[PDB]
C-alpha cells in the first residue's frame, strides 16, 4: 500500500514485480519444506 | 495470521480419536 | 534553493558525478523528493556580468549527501603546504559565475528548488488538502490515515500508544493500530472477515 | 569520422586527473567502468579513438 | 575515574508501538557493561570528543547541571548548539555565542525555542544533520555511583541543525556527578512487554551467550 | 571483487543483485537436492 | 595486484607459471596465485583462517 500510494504504475509495476518475485521465492521454499516434512511425517505415520 | 494463512481443522476430532483408541483397547 | 549554471542542472540527481554534485551539493541514492528548476537569465544577470553567484570546484573529498560546506580554506594543490596564502599550487576553493545576458543557454543562471520529503514515521506536520470524513467504527471501511491506505475494521481498543507513537505494526509490518490525528484516541485495525 | 584514428597506448602511468578536472568536455559518459575508480586499476591495453 | 554502565543506554530505536514481541534492530546504542568516564562536581567541565554519538547520565540533588554546548571549536567562530534549562523553561538556541574560558552559570541564529535523588539519562547523536534528544526522568536513592537497573529512554526533540559537531561541553550551577558514554553501530535484541515498554535487552556482541540469545 | 573494483555503488547494486539472485537459486537447488538425498539415506538407514 | 583486490595470505610457492601467464584461477575462478609485477616471482593466495 505504501508503494501504491506513492508511485504511479510506470514505477509501481517494477517495484510490485520485485515484491512478487521475493514473495514467490518465499512461498515456493515454504511449500517445498512443507512437502518434505509431510513426506517424513507420512513415513512416521506408516510406521505407526 | 491475517495474511491468508489459515489452519484447517482435522476431519477426526480428539473425541473420535479417543473413541477409536477406546475401541481398540477394549477389543 | 540555489542558482546554478545550465550545464549543472543534470547533476542534481542520485548517483550523479560532477563538479557541483561532488563538491557543492550531493544527493543520496535513496532520495525521496522532487527537483524543480527554471531559467532566470532575465533576473540573475548583470549587463557586464553578475559575479555574485559562487560555487566550489576545489575540495579534496567528495561530499556526503545533504552536506553544507562553507570552508574558505585554501586548497593545497602541490606538495608544499599553504599556510593561508594563495598563489602557486595554492588556490582559492570557490569560483564566481559570470552571468551575462549574451551567453548561451547552457551557461545561463537557473533557479533550482529541491524538495525532500522525509517519510520517517512520526506525528506528521505537512499534509495535503483533503475533505476529512467522519469515522465509522465496527464496520468494514476503506480507511486513510495520513496517507496510509488500507482496508479493515476500526474498533475501540486498549493498546496504550506512547505520545510520540503514531502507528503500530504487526509481525509482517501490517498496520495493527493507528492513532487518529484529529482526536488523540486509540483504534485497532482488524481486516474484514 | 570514417577515417577515425586509433592510438595504441602502453607502458605508462595514467592519473586521469586532468580528464576529471577539465570542464571543457561537454559530454562525459563511461559505460563499462565507472569514471572515478580509473587510477586504481591497471589494464593490459588502452585505445584512444 | 571510570565506572560500570551495566544496562543503561537503550532507547526506542523508532516511534513504532510493539508489544509482546522480541525485535532486533541496528542503531547507535551504549554498550552493556562498559567504561563510561566518571566526572565529579564537588569541592570539572572539560571538552570531550563526539565521535559517533554520546550517552550522558546525571545524578542530581539540587539541579546543578543545567546546560549543554555542542560544536567543534566553541569560540563563536563556528556554529554551536546551546541548551539551557533553568527553573521552568528549557531554552534551546543555535546562535554563534561567545563563550568564556570555562562556561558556567551562577546561582547568525537559525532557531530558538523557549519552553542523589534524581537520575537524568540522555543520548545525543547526529544522523544526517538531525540532532535528537532522548531523555527520561526516574527517581533513585544512591549517591556513590550510577545505580544498576534498566529503564527505557524516550524521544522528545528532533532538531535538524545540520551542524558538524565533534566537541561537546557541559554546564554547571555554581553557588552532581555525571557520566559520558559512547555509541557504536551494534545489533541488539529488544524485549517489549504487554504495555509496549522495553523491559530487557541483549547486546549481540557482548559475549557468546548473548550471541546465542540473539 | 572485479565488479566492486570497476563500478561505483549505485550501478554495482544491480550487478551484485544479479549475482545474489543466481547464487541464491544455486544454493536453494543444492539444499533441496541435499534434503531429498538425506531423506532417501534416512529411509535406507531405517531399513538397516 | 594490478587492480585485482582480495584478502588472503601470500606465501612462497612452487607453481611454475608460464612466462605469458599473470594470474592463476581456481575451480570457482577465485584468484589462486599471482605473479608479482615488480619482481617476477611466484606466490600463492590462501584466504585467511
Ligand atoms: C482537530 O479538531 C479538533 C476540534 O474538533 C481539535 O481539538 C484538534 O486539535 C484538531 N486537530 C489538530 C491536529 O489540531
Ligand atoms: C575498563 O577499565 C578497567 C580499569 O578501570 C580495565 O581493566 C578494563 O579492561 C576496561 N574495559 C574496557 C572495555 O575498556
Ligand atoms: C531562563 O533563561 C533565559 C535565557 O534564554 C532567560 O531569558 C529567562 O529569563 C530565564 N528564566 C526563566 C524563568 O525562564
Ligand atoms: C554570519 O555568516 C556570514 C556568512 O554569510 C558571515 O559573513 C558573517 O560574518 C557572519 N556573522 C558574524 C557575526 O560572524
Ligand atoms: C567536522 O569538523 C572536523 C574538524 O573540526 C573535520 O575534521 C571533519 O571532517 C568535519 N566533518 C565533515 C563532514 O566535514
Ligand atoms: C500495564 O499498565 C497497567 C497500568 O495501566 C498495569 O496495571 C499493568 O501491570 C501493566 N502491564 C505490564 C505488563 O507492565
Ligand atoms: C621494478 O623495479 C625493479 C628494480 O627494483 C626492476 O628490476 C623491475 O624491472 C621493475 N618492474 C618493471 C615492471 O619494470
Amino acid at each position: 500500500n505504501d508503494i501504491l500510494s506513492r508511485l504511479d504504475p510506470p514505477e509501481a509495476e517494477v517495484q510490485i514485480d520485485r515484491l512478487i518475485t521475493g514473495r514467490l521465492q518465499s512461498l515456493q521454499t515454504y511449500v517445498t519444506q512443507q512437502l518434505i516434512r509431510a513426506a517424513e511425517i507420512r513415513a512416521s505415520a506408516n510406521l505407526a | 495470521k491475517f495474511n491468508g494463512l489459515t489452519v484447517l481443522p482435522p476431519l477426526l476430532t480428539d473425541e473420535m480419536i479417543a473413541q477409536y483408541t477406546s475401541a481398540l483397547l477394549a477389543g | 534553493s540555489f542558482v546554478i549554471r545550465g550545464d549543472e542542472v543534470r547533476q542534481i540527481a542520485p548517483g550523479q558525478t560532477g563538479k557541483i554534485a561532488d563538491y557543492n551539493y550531493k544527493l543520496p541514492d535513496d532520495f525521496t523528493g522532487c527537483v524543480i528548476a527554471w531559467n532566470s537569465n532575465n533576473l540573475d544577470s548583470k549587463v557586464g556580468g553578475n559575479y555574485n553567484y559562487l560555487y566550489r570546484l576545489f575540495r579534496k573529498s567528495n561530499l556526503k549527501p545533504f552536506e553544507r560546506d562553507i570552508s574558505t580554506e585554501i586548497y593545497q594543490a602541490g606538495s608544499t603546504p599553504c599556510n593561508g596564502v594563495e598563489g602557486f599550487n595554492c588556490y582559492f576553493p570557490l569560483q564566481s559565475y559570470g552571468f551575462q545576458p549574451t551567453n548561451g543557454v547552457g551557461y545561463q543562471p537557473y533557479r533550482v528548488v529541491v524538495l525532500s520529503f522525509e517519510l520517517l514515521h512520526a506525528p506528521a506536520t505537512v499534509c495535503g488538502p483533503k475533505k476529512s470524513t467522519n469515522l465509522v467504527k465496527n464496520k468494514c471501511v476503506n480507511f486513510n490515515f495520513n496517507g496510509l491506505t488500507g482496508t479493515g475494521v476500526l474498533t475501540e481498543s486498549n493498546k496504550k500508544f506512547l505520545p510520540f507513537q503514531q502507528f503500530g505494526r504487526d509481525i509482517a509490518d501490517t498496520t495493527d493500530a493507528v492513532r487518529d490525528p484529529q482526536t488523540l484516541e486509540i483504534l485497532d485495525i482488524t481486516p474484514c472477515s | 569520422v570514417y577515417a577515425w584514428n586509433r592510438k595504441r597506448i602502453s607502458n605508462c602511468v595514467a592519473d586521469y586527473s586532468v580528464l576529471y578536472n577539465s570542464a571543457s568536455f561537454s559530454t562525459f559518459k563511461c559505460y563499462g567502468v565507472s569514471p572515478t575508480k580509473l587510477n586504481d586499476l591497471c589494464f593490459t591495453n588502452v585505445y584512444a579513438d | 575515574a571510570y565506572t560500570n554502565s551495566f544496562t543503561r543506554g537503550v532507547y526506542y530505536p523508532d516511534k513504532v508501538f510493539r508489544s509482546s514481541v522480541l525485535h532486533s534492530t541496528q542503531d547507535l546504542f551504549l554498550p552493556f557493561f562498559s567504561n563510561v568516564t566518571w566526572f565529579h562536581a564537588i569541592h570539572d567541565n572539560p571538552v570531550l570528543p563526539f565521535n559517533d554519538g554520546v550517552y550522558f547520565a546525571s545524578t542530581e540533588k539540587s539541579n546543578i547541571i543545567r546546560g549543554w554546548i555542542f560544536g567543534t571549536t566553541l569560540d563563536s567562530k563556528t556554529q554551536s548548539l546551546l541548551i539551557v534549562n533553568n527553573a521552568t523553561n528549557v531554552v534551546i538556541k543555535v546562535c554563534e555565542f561567545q563563550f568564556c574560558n570555562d562556561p558556567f552559570l551562577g546561582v547568525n541564529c537559525t532557531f530558538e525555542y523557549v519552553s542523589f535523588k534524581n537520575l537524568r539519562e540522555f543520548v545525543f547523536k547526529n544522523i544526517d544533520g538531525y540532532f535528537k534528544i532522548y531523555s527520561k526522568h526516574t527517581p533513585i536513592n544512591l549517591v556513590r555511583d550510577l545505580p544498576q537497573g534498566f529503564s527505557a529512554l524516550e524521544p522528545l526533540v528532533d532538531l535538524p541543525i545540520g551542524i558538524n559537531i565533534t566537541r561537546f561541553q557541559t554546564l554547571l550551577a555554581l553557588h552532581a556527578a555525571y557520566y559520558v558514554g559512547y555509541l557504536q553501530p551494534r545489533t541488539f535484541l529488544l524485549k517489549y512487554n504487554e504495555n509496549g515498554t522495553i523491559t530487557d535487552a541483549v547486546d549481540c556482541a557482548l559475549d557468546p551467550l548473548s550471541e546465542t540469545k540473539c
Side-chain angles (χ1 to χ4, degrees), chain A, chain B, chain C, chain D, chain E:
Chain A
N1 290 347
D2 181 1
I3 302 170
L4 284 164
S5 69
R6 286 200 290 158
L7 291 202
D8 60 356
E11 313 176 3
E13 61 205 90
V14 177
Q15 309 298 312
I16 281 166
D17 199 290
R18 288 179 191 177
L19 272 294
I20 288 174
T21 48
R23 291 171 180 181
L24 273 172
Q25 285 185 3
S26 70
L27 263 183
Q28 261 169 42
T29 304
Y30 167 75
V31 168
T32 303
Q33 300 271 32
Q34 285 293 94
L35 279 157
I36 298 166
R37 196 173 296 111
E40 177 178 351
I41 290 298
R42 191 194 311 108
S44 68
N46 286 342
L47 173 60
Chain B
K1 186 184 172 182
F2 263 53
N3 302 296
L5 281 75
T6 64
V7 168
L8 303 172
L11 178 61
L12 278 77
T13 63
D14 307 74
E15 181 183 0
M16 309 197 186
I17 309 302
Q19 285 188 38
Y20 278 166
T21 54
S22 173
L24 290 159
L25 182 89
Chain C
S1 49
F2 43 86
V3 163
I4 58 175
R5 190 199 303 178
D7 297 323
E8 312 296 326
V9 182
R10 281 82 65 193
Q11 293 198 12
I12 302 297
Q16 264 272 7
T17 67
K19 193 67 74 69
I20 299 301
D22 295 348
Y23 294 153
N24 291 262
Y25 188 50
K26 182 65 177 177
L27 274 300
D29 283 0
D30 191 23
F31 175 52
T32 63
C34 292
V35 174
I36 310 166
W38 67 92
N39 197 303
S40 64
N41 195 26
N42 46 67
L43 284 181
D44 306 323
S45 174
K46 289 182 179 182
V47 59
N50 183 26
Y51 288 86
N52 297 266
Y53 283 100
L54 273 296
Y55 72 104
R56 169 179 316 276
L57 59 84
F58 285 143
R59 191 177 153 93
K60 62 183 192 182
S61 70
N62 307 272
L63 294 176
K64 299 183 179 180
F66 283 124
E67 199 174 357
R68 178 84 174 274
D69 192 278
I70 323 294
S71 180
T72 305
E73 181 188 349
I74 293 174
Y75 181 76
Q76 180 182 324
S79 57
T80 78
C82 315
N83 304 133
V85 177
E86 67 178 0
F88 292 157
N89 289 325
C90 303
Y91 302 131
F92 182 111
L94 299 160
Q95 188 67 268
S96 200
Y97 273 132
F99 282 155
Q100 297 159 336
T102 63
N103 302 133
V105 181
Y107 182 75
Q108 269 176 21
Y110 272 78
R111 294 197 164 187
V112 185
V113 187
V114 171
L115 276 297
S116 305
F117 313 101
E118 156 247 8
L119 256 119
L120 170 72
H121 289 88
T125 65
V126 40
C127 313
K130 260 198 163 184
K131 298 179 181 179
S132 71
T133 62
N134 192 13
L135 57 92
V136 181
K137 289 181 180 175
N138 310 317
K139 196 169 88 182
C140 183
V141 292
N142 190 359
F143 53 87
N144 195 310
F145 289 96
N146 302 323
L148 191 138
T149 315
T151 304
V153 178
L154 310 175
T155 67
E156 189 180 1
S157 71
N158 56 337
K159 296 175 186 175
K160 192 259 179 173
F161 276 11
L162 277 297
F164 57 103
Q165 297 176 324
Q166 185 61 37
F167 305 102
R169 286 189 183 274
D170 213 326
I171 306 301
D173 60 18
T174 60
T175 312
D176 184 56
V178 290
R179 182 179 61 182
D180 191 288
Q182 280 189 357
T183 187
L184 294 174
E185 65 177 3
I186 62 170
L187 315 168
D188 288 332
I189 297 169
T190 298
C192 312
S193 177
Chain D
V1 186
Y2 74 106
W4 50 274
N5 279 346
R6 181 172 198 86
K7 177 68 174 66
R8 193 183 184 222
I9 312 168
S10 291
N11 291 315
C12 80
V13 285
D15 50 350
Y16 311 106
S17 62
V18 286
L19 282 72
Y20 298 116
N21 204 0
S22 299
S24 56
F25 311 135
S26 66
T27 62
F28 203 93
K29 316 163 187 178
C30 293
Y31 300 147
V33 65
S34 58
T36 295
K37 64 179 73 174
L38 277 182
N39 46 1
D40 56 351
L41 287 174
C42 188
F43 291 162
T44 302
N45 195 0
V46 58
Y47 294 101
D49 295 331
Chain E
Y2 293 87
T3 180
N4 202 331
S5 64
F6 304 98
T7 54
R8 313 290 183 175
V10 169
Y11 50 86
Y12 292 80
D14 60 357
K15 304 184 164 69
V16 176
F17 180 82
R18 301 179 184 86
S19 63
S20 304
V21 63
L22 309 183
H23 181 68
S24 297
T25 187
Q26 179 67 42
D27 187 49
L28 279 294
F29 296 136
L30 186 74
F32 292 166
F33 295 100
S34 179
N35 282 351
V36 298
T37 310
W38 184 14
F39 285 165
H40 295 285
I42 58 173
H43 294 292
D44 191 16
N45 46 4
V47 181
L48 284 82
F50 197 63
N51 291 318
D52 286 314
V54 161
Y55 174 66
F56 192 13
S58 287
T59 61
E60 280 282 358
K61 182 62 67 141
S62 53
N63 201 28
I64 299 301
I65 303 159
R66 293 180 188 173
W68 287 266
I69 284 165
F70 314 92
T72 52
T73 65
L74 283 66
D75 50 3
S76 196
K77 296 178 176 66
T78 193
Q79 195 57 268
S80 180
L81 178 60
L82 187 151
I83 305 175
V84 163
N85 182 17
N86 46 4
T88 52
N89 306 330
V90 180
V91 188
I92 295 94
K93 291 182 176 179
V94 293
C95 300
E96 290 184 356
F97 290 110
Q98 177 61 70
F99 291 163
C100 304
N101 44 358
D102 46 350
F104 72 101
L105 181 69
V107 173
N108 281 18
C109 318
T110 56
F111 170 82
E112 174 178 358
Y113 164 73
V114 176
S115 292
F116 296 103
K117 296 293 188 180
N118 294 279
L119 186 56
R120 262 57 161 149
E121 305 90 335
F122 295 87
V123 185
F124 300 144
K125 66 182 188 180
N126 290 50
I127 297 173
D128 297 331
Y130 277 38
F131 195 76
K132 306 168 193 286
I133 304 312
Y134 292 162
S135 71
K136 160 79 176 178
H137 301 265
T138 185
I140 51 166
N141 299 278
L142 214 50
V143 71
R144 176 194 166 268
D145 217 339
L146 188 150
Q148 186 170 2
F150 190 32
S151 180
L153 184 63
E154 63 258 9
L156 291 184
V157 172
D158 200 342
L159 189 55
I161 61 171
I163 304 172
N164 181 28
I165 295 167
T166 57
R167 267 85 66 177
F168 76 98
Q169 199 171 12
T170 191
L171 280 74
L172 299 164
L174 279 73
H175 286 280
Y178 64 96
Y179 316 90
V180 172
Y182 288 95
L183 315 176
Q184 43 266 27
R186 296 185 102 87
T187 56
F188 292 60
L189 182 62
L190 281 208
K191 176 173 179 180
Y192 293 87
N193 58 0
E194 287 84 3
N195 290 10
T197 305
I198 305 160
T199 60
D200 209 341
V202 159
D203 196 338
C204 303
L206 178 62
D207 45 49
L209 179 57
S210 296
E211 286 178 38
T212 311
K213 285 179 177 180
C214 284

